[PDB]
Design a protein around this ligand. Structure first.
Ligand SMILES: COc1cc(C(=O)NC2CCN(C)CC2)ccc1Nc1ncc2c(n1)N(C1CCCC1)CC(F)(F)C(=O)N2C
Ligand SMILES: [Cl-]
Length: 110
């Protein structure tokens, strides 16, 4: 990994760590819309994204730069803001995890 992608990998590891598990856990795995009863999920959300997919793409060297990584993480949050009422608990959890992400992403070496 490049220096910037090392920083992204560190962010990823942090977002998956026990320190943030109380609000990060809905984002660990792909939304299983059928299991959750969300039968309109894939009509509303065109591009699903989750942290296990980000992790697989990092491991496979899919991301060519930090911007591509950031776009996927932010896409995950945007899907949550699109599908759920703004006052829902899961949106509150998204906001808190995105705060962790954005403040550490801003510390990118450059
Ligand atoms: C097994 O996992 C869960 C279990 C329970 C669970 O067990 N809920 C209760 C069931 C009955 N008892 C056990 C109390 C908890 C609830 C949610 C789960 N998982 C999940 N992952 C991701 C999302 C999500 N949920 N969101 C929630 C909001 C409300 C309806 C799903 C909707 C969403 F659109 F998919 C979304 O954006 N995200 C980010
Ligand atoms: Cl972006």
């Amino acid at each position: 990994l490049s220096e910037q992608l090392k920083h992204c990998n560190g962010i990823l590891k942090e977002l998956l760590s026990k320190k943030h598990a109380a609000y990060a856990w809905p984002f660990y795995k792909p939304v299983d819309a059928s299991a959750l009863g969300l039968h309109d999920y894939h009509d509303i959300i065109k591009h699903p994204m989750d942290l296990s997919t980000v992790k697989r793409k990092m491991e496979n060297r899919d991301y060519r730069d930090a911007q591509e990584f950031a776009a996927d993480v932010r896409l995950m949050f945007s899907n949550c803001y699109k599908y759920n009422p703004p006052d829902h608990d899961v949106v509150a959890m998204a906001r808190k995890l995105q705060d962790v992400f954005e403040f550490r992403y801003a510390k990118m070496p450059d």
